């Protein structure tokens, strides 16, 4: 029997690159996603095409509430039955915008930045663990968590949470087999709203190659944390930034 | 004019002798509290015994929900009501319990220890910035961030997520004068439950001194930060710990 | 053309796995070492029946003086002489005795410690990006924060590590040159330490209550100098099994 | 009797602050240098004017060598010879300039930036605690070990190391009732080298003030870590720096 993963926020950029890989891998796969119905379905048609029920969808929106704990043991059962079993948890869903100290409101930003970014893989986390080989879950985090952007606090608390998310639960779930550990991009693909001029500018901040990385580049560092040669690893965080975080101001 | 300081719960403990050894620099203080009810005037009593009409006491419950925003602002609100202005905050409350992965329940644990740890004290950043000549705020942190202990991850992901805030909050209120700092205790005040036994197996971990430090060693660097010695010193975590986070397993 | 990979101190233990690993990979391997000859020659047939060709040894002390510079370039040339080519780099070779602060002279053990953990790797990457997928694996420390009693200038040689690995990848970037790091927990224990002490140490990893073994510290390598890892340069990977997650 | 302190490299910029702030507390102090004589002796001459026998000087070269160890030997000796104490060290002595990977050959280079930074402050601990109540020894670090200066290898390896023996000393020593702790730096006193141009540049890089340091407040560290307001404090390193490690590439 094949194993199965769980990938939040499937269905497009550097999550649709974990679940193509971790398919061609051998695994099948669950496609989280909350608004790209559209590509999270056709998505897992393609990879249904070439291999027959091997792929499942499932949405839910991942911000704080009374009821995302529910919400998120439902994504690990899909993948109980779908599947008959979980294998892998890739948390990569995220809220990524601007909250300055100085049209949503701040107890929406507070929920949808710390919700996507920390308290959902926690839950996650708790479900995937609870209903327990090569059982492990993996967190893409931020290279530049200490070096963060200007008036992104809420989002950088999220991702410095899930370091110790990160941290916290390799030491918990070890005695049952279950290895926690992180993927840390510094800048890869840019946000799809990035005009091509601010595109360049931070192409050129970084050292190896003068570009950003592709979604496949850090699928790469997840597909290894997955697999056999990464036995003994948990609570590690693996940077995938071309020396970014290195660079100073 | 004296100065003001608001300190978040500071009936009890590392809390009050933050805000009484403030007082003694000179400070007008509010004495934050949650349930520790009688403690807060008892001392507030104290404190304008000895200087009229420089302490003030206010009651608020940090556990992260919608209404938690009108809380932080009020607790602002309560000091430039009392004392006409607002000079230092100081993040002292937090909840501190076990929140396994393997009474309350799940979304109380977390809306408690991410709320008080972390989102309570990012709205109090707001606030205090938002109402706004030696400005500054002072988190009190964790120096075993990156050694936890076990089943403790709720809270763990809160101390992380102060990190992230203070590092932040400091760059982007960096232009306005405001110096954002935080304080790391490894074993001080052991908890009230703890028994003797366990309270000595923890100061035998402790390189320097083999015991906890006293409130009034933590409160020491506090004063240190929010001092003209510190003008320059900004997102910082000065661990307190006696050495405690170099010992290895 | 086969690729080829300069391991120090390759005649045993981790050393010798990554030298293994590297040529299974159809790498071609330079063994390097110190003192234990009979072992890095005896490998060296061992690689050299399975491809003929493929593995030299090559001996050199990384002690630090005034001439490691020279034995540095040296290591880095014999690579060049048997292979044609120098492709990987892998800092291994490391002094380990403690040195408290209250049979060496000190001025021997800051030589020996401080010259084989940092000085030396400082050398060979100078040596490796002047005479040019080519990277450079350092092997640290997962436990530089956490640091064992008395052992300060050994510490002070890992640490230096990380900043020579931070250092190099910055500037060796613009060449294409990738500098990286593995950091062990506990894995192959000394000796040289008695069973008793083994089996206290054993009982303190989250992950299996063992010690990482030589082959699971090679995987990491393996894959800092593979084309999965491309974009992947100034990082340190914890190979420890939770250890430095542990509190005391 | 009035405690002593031995400050390496005290004759100018940095050092001579940290000299003339430890002997306005009340520290008798011993003025190392290396080059700058009348610049040491000058200041010895002041510091005397203001209290009698409280200032001598003690000329030493610490790059490394055979002959370092009784170097950092005899400037503990100086102290223990005019003062018949020593309890506080402060390793301020650096060499800073470019070791690209690709005048000075490269084991002289090896030897001055290693040397003055690591090697050097670990002889000086190892003979300060030999011949050993507030005893404290204060190492001065740099804010950017992590975002290091381009072709500065064998500097920040210093740095680093320094670092290192911060964390391994603190440990250690803590049983004798020596606390080891750091100051970091970002941007204090520019290079007397650097031009007005590039000077301005670093300067408008820094958050607080966008303007560098006073040596002065760089002092101000050193002197609360010494202190009895940091009696619990060993292992910490204190960053000084305006917010300048937190600024993105
Ligand atoms: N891109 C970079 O340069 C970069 C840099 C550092 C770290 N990372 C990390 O790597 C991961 C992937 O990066 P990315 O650029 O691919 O990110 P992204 O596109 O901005 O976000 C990934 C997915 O998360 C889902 N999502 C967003 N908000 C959600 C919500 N409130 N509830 C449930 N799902 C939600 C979205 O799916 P739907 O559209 O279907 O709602 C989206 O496709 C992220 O964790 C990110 O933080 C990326
Ligand atoms: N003590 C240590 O060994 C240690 C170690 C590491 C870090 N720290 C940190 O240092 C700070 C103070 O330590 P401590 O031991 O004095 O803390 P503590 O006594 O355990 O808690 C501090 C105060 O927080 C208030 N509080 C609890 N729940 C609250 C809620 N839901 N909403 C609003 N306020 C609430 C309580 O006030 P009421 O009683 O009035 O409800 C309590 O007095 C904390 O941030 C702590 O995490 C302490
Ligand atoms: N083993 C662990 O638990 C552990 C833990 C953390 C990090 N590491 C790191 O992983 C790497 C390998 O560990 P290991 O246990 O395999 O190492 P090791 O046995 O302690 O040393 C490896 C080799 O280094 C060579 N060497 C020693 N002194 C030298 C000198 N003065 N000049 C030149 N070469 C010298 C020796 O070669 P010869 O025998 O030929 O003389 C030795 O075989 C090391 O860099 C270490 O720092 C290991
Ligand atoms: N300036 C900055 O922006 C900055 C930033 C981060 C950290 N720091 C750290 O802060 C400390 C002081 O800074 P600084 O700017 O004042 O340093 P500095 O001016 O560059 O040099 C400090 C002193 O060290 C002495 N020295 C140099 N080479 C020596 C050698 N080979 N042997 C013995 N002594 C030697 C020199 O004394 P003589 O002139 O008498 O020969 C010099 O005055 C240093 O440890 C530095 O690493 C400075
Ligand atoms: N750009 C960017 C992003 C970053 C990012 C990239 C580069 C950075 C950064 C955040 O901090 C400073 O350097 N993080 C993101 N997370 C999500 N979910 N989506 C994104 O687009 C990004
Ligand atoms: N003991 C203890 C506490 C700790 C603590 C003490 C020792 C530790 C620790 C947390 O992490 C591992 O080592 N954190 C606390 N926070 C609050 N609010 N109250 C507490 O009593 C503690
Ligand atoms: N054991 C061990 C070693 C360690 C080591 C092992 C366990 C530790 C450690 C270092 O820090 C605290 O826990 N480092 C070594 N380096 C070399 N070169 N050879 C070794 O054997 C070890
Ligand atoms: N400028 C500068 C210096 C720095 C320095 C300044 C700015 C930096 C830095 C080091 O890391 C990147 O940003 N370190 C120094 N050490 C000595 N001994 N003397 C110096 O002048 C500096």
């Known amino acids: 029997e094949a194993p199965a993963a769980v990938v939040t926020g499937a269905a497009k950029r550097i999550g649709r690159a974990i679940a193509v890989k971790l398919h061609q891998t051998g695994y099948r796969v669950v496609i989280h996603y909350h608004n790209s119905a559209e590509a999270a379905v056709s998505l897992a048609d393609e ?109 950088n608390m999220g991702k410095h949470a899930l370091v110790g998310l990160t941290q916290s639960a390799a030491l918990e779930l070890a005695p049952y087999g279950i290895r926690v550990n992180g993927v840390a991009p510094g800048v890869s693909l840019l946000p799809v709203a990035m005009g091509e001029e601010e595109k360049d500018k931070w192409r050129r901040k970084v050292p190896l190659g003068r570009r950003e990385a592709s979604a496949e580049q850090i699928a790469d560092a997840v597909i290894f944390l997955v697999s056999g040669s990464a036995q003994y690893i948990t609570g590690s965080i693996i940077k995938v930034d071309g020396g970014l975080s290195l660079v100073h101001a």
């Open 47 to 155: 990879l249904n095409k070439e291999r027959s029920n091997t792929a499942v969808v499932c949405q839910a929106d991942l911000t704080n509430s009374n009821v995302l704990p529910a919400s998120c043991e439902e994504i690990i059962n899909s993948c109980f039955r779908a599947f008959g079993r979980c294998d892998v948890l890739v948390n990569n869903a995220s809220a990524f915008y601007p909250t300055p100290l100085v049209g949503k409101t701040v107890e929406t930003q507070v929920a949808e930045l710390i919700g996507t970014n920390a308290i959902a893989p926690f839950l996650l986390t708790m479900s995937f663990a609870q209903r327990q080989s090569n059982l492990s879950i993996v967190n893409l985090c931020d290279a530049m968590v200490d070096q963060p952007c200007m008036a992104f606090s809420l989002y």
